[PDB]
């Protein structure tokens, strides 16, 4: 209920410009930045991988992990 279950355009744009300086990104980490609940947060983790920013260094279920692109 307490917000983060959709996409509000400003949110999408927020997600592109707010993920540098993130030495760590994951499911938890994304919810932590006052946005996206674990579900649509998980989708971001695939679609930030669409191209750029996130490097897949850890595998699977529960635990995700990425770092800023190089």
């Amino acid at each position: 209920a307490q917000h983060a279950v959709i996409l509000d355009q400003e949110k999408y744009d927020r997600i592109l410009k707010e993920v540098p300086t993130y030495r760590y990104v994951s499911v938890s980490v994304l919810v932590d930045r006052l946005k996206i609940g674990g579900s649509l947060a998980r989708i971001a983790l695939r679609h930030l991988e669409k191209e750029g920013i996130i490097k897949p260094i850890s595998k699977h279920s529960k635990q995700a992990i990425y770092t800023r692109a190089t």
Binding site: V5, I6, L7, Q9, Y12
Partner: protein, 145 residues
């Protein structure tokens, strides 16, 4: 799956079946706050209605929603089995029903009363506030009323 977008198209919360339903929840489960629709029933119905379950209650075209209600209150027509239903073989007209929403309350009454009104021990026992399904009543259930 896919990063989606939409405009102002989705409205949060949406009333149907004389009750209220939260949008920002995956629609399958959203519908379960209606009395008489467990997860299973919800599942089969939306599958029947040709609706994407990856969606929330939030999206879901008004037409999609209309179709969803339709099947619910007529399950035998839209090819849902019979053993899937909360009231097979009535006890008067013998039809098979899926009693929904504000009505399942009505029917719990009808039956309970039918028992009492018939003086059946089950009923007597219901009226006394005790457990009926033949459990030991010595140690368990103390808080209760």
């Amino acid at each position: 799956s896919l990063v989606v977008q939409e405009q102002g198209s989705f409205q949060h919360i949406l009333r149907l079946l004389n009750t209220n339903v939260d949008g920002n929840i995956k629609i399958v489960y959203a519908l379960t706050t209606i009395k008489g629709v467990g997860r299973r029933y919800s599942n089969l119905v939306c599958k029947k209605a040709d609706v994407d379950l990856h969606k929330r209650a939030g999206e879901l075209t008004q037409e999609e929603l209309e179709r969803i209600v339709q099947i619910m209150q007529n399950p035998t027509h839209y090819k849902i089995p019979a053993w899937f239903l909360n009231r097979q073989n009535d006890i008067t007209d013998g039809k098979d029903y899926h009693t929904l929403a504000n009505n399942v309350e009505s029917k719990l009454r009808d039956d309970l009363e039918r028992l009492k009104k018939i003086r059946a021990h089950r009923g007597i026992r219901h009226f006394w506030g005790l457990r009926v399904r033949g459990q030991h009543t010595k140690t368990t259930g103390r808080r209760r009323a």
